[PDB]
Amino acid sequence: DYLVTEEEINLTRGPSGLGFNIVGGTDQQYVSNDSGIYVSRIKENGAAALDGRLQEGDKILSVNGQDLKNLLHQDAVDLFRNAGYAVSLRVQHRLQVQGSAYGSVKAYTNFDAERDALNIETAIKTKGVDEVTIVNILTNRSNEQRQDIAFAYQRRTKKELASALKSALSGHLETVILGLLKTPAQYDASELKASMKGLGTDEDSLIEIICSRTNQELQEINRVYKEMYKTDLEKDIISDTSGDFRKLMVALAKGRRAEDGSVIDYELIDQDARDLYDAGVKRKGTDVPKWISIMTERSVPHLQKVFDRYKSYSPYDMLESIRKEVKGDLENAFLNLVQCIQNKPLYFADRLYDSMKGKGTRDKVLIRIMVSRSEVDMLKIRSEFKRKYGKSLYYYIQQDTKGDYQKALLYLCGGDD
């Protein structure tokens, strides 16, 4: 949750004071748990600003050897009021890095799972439904916090929060909010199930998920999929797919890719670049199993260098080589997999653009990406999108969607660029 280093700071009271404002206490807890004392503001040109060691957000542990643990707000203030002009502080510097730093949606600081579950009830129970309030909460909260809100709402109402919103919402907005409530593994599992449900597979969605997920994510998806649907994901893929496209998807969904080692294996990088060339462009036909094993077994950093070393031997790069060697679902899968290896944020930027560029909106693609990447690499996606397409992802969502559905997507986007 937090990274912590502690520092002793000695300050000389200026006439304005020590030059900072404190918050906290047992009677005014800054968050739901900590009763500590925190620096909420550092006055410009104050004794603490000039000293430069104190930071906004630090926790005051002790003042002149007196601990500030479990004190009322007034008891903490009174310790400063009687401290004299030479004040010795012991502070705790805090860095809030957790999850990913490239995610649009972060954990809400003043989080209270009970009040949110309460306020979502109010909204469901208001006449006409306050969707805006449902959206303002659930899109501003981490996926873990949404799980807490789902737990509280069940205990208070004896109904599952998702089943309640499933009745209080409709259309595209319902799809977004219901997606946000599932865990990452549950959402991917159900999205995978929906693409294979029915004779006739949505290979587009199946490729996107299976190609873009890491070993850690696929291992979890495999566990949750079997819990939810009483069958193995690998078995459902074998049933809905065939040919070398089946081989590729089965190997990828296993999530047994080599982990990034500390040592870069330049010798293997060159051999794999030679193999990929021998199996495809250099020969008549294509040794597809050789392509599958290299591109599914080797680690992502390794394969990034393999694709560049491949350009030393082949007159075409990997993507052009795939378009010249295979067709159909197999070609689609290789092209997606290589893009995920080379630049996954750009891959999602391109799929976002394709879901909105022309007539209408491929809402199923737009929604899944905004949901499943909002806490992973959405800020990198927006950076690649802005760099390539000139306008922001915010702007394209704004032009393709409307209403509270747009607002939710704009929140999951996280802002303009």
Partner: peptide, 6 residues
């Protein structure tokens, strides 16, 4: 809340 100046 209650920012208190010290």
């Amino acid at each position: 809340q209650s920012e208190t100046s010290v």
